[PDB]
């Protein structure tokens, strides 16, 4: 267990915790490339919400993601619905690798 250590000592009762963001400041963000990932799954075509719809794939430009273009029709009001659903999750697997740059942290 000790092989995973990252700090010299542990929290010992009344340790003063200093906040490091003292002023409003737009961030500058640095990281290692593998610290952030995007987990993506197209919504299954048999999902209870996308039941009566005729689903197809739908690629998102620039980013490498694919969502679902679903579509359904109605007789009584001779109308139609379309729905582009993109399912994704941004995950920070290495926060210790992700960083933030805060300039102008004046008192």
């Amino acid at each position: 267990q000790r092989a995973y250590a990252n700090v010299n000592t542990s929290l010992a009762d009344a340790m003063a915790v200093n906040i490091l963001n003292v002023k409003d400041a737009r961030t500058n963000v640095f990281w290692a490339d593998d610290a952030i990932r995007i987990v993506s799954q197209p919504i299954p075509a048999n999902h209870e919400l996308f039941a009566g719809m005729k689903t197809t794939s739908f690629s998102i430009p620039d980013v490498g993601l694919n969502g679902i273009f679903a579509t359904q029709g109605d007789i009584s009001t001779l109308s139609g619905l379309c729905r582009i659903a993109l399912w994704y999750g941004v995950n920070a697997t290495r926060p210790e690798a992700i960083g933030v740059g805060l300039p102008g942290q004046t008192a």
Binding site: N46, E48, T55, T56, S57, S59
Partner: protein, 541 residues
Amino acid sequence: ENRLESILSRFDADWTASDEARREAKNDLFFSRVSQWDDWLSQYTTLQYRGQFDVVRPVVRKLVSEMRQNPIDVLYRPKDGARPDAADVLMGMYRTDMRHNTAKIAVNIAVREQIEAGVGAWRLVTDYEDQSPTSNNQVIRREPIHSACSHVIWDSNSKLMDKSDARHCTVIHSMSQNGWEDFAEKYDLDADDIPSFQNPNDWVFPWLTQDTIQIAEFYEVVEKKETAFIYQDPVTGEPVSYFKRDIKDVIDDLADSGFIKIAERQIKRRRVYKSIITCTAVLKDKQLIAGEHIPIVPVFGEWGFVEDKEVYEGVVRLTKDGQRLRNMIMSFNADIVARTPKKKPFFWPEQIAGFEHMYDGNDDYPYYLLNRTDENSGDLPTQPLAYYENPEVPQANAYMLEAATSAVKEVATLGVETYVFQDNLATAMRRDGEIYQSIVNDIYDVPRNVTILMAEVVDLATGEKQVLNDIRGRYECYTDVGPSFQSMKQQNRAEILELLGKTPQGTPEYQLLLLQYFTLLDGKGVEMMRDYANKQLIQMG
């Protein structure tokens, strides 16, 4: 009045009229190519055992191999009353520009789709070749069309197997971003304005990415009377007929070269126009292409009409129910085998209280001990020991597995042999021969053979472009089907061998043997042998 509105109305009518067959063919393709558990639309389904114990695929493989072992290609033969060698030039050109890998691959893809779904197709295109051109710095290549059922849409009022009476046909091309960019570069389109058209393929299997960009090519053939010019041949002969749509930039150069106009006649002919369209605009309007026919050749399996409506079937449509039932029964049996309590005894806890380590499953004891006395009931009641019954496959399950397998085996027999499918392929190849002959007469430089040599009567315009000149005596050869040969020399060798096999050992046998030696490929020893044969043939007069 709108060209776009008219084209889209025609396409909508045809796509609607050809909906059932397209859906069935797509289902057959998916079932026989990807997976037999086509339950993508089934909602509220958890995950259970779904095996694939295939019994249809070996039949499809056997049929594919049987039709692979017998290649079929066009064979041009001189018509009745024409010269005996009226088809040599056309046959040589056809073999030269159809010997390549692309033609064979397209035919194989069409045949496989015909066996599996029931319909396939391929296309003929003309390209500019500068290194090894067939004729007039051009080549003709046969390209494949994948999923013809959903990608090639024919005219609805076409009651022919080869669609030679249909006048329009829309081919849907789907690609990714890079494919669309290179397509636009090739066709001088606008790459930035992404196109869109009717999506021809469904999303069934969990593919991460499908085709995104869609476009259509609408071919229409128009039969009309156009002016023909009857010139007089200055090189040698009597009048040669040329059309007026061509011989346009050289209409004044013919007179300079020495052609004198004799008369003017109106002749009815067919012209093909291609238009590149999307769902909202027409990119190319009426670009005239070469040939008298739509360059798309379809191949069919079991084809017919039910009620003003086309139906085509392969070998997989009628086996799907039995195969699915077999898969379901086998999955149920696997569930029975897996999730079923095994054969173990039933015990009251007080019967084995204190001896529970004897029944754990070791082999350290000579016998098992059971408790006998109870402090309140005097003695433990006596009852025969029960065991959980072993798992059993139901008689219904076994009978239905056997019956479904028998039904699939009975119904998955194409014919008795693939004779009907080979005949349909031959019909497709005859249509291919017709289309190729039209394209050759339109773009190639076909020499005319005289009985007085080959006279290539050609000329160039002031812009250095070469304009072909073809007389109206161009349909001197009709179409047939023969074995596929890679070259005219190979065909000649086959013909000589066939004649030799029927000629008895007389003087014609010697003549044909020497001819076979003459028509042999060259090395060094075979070079000497062929030189000897040539000397003998010349010396024998």
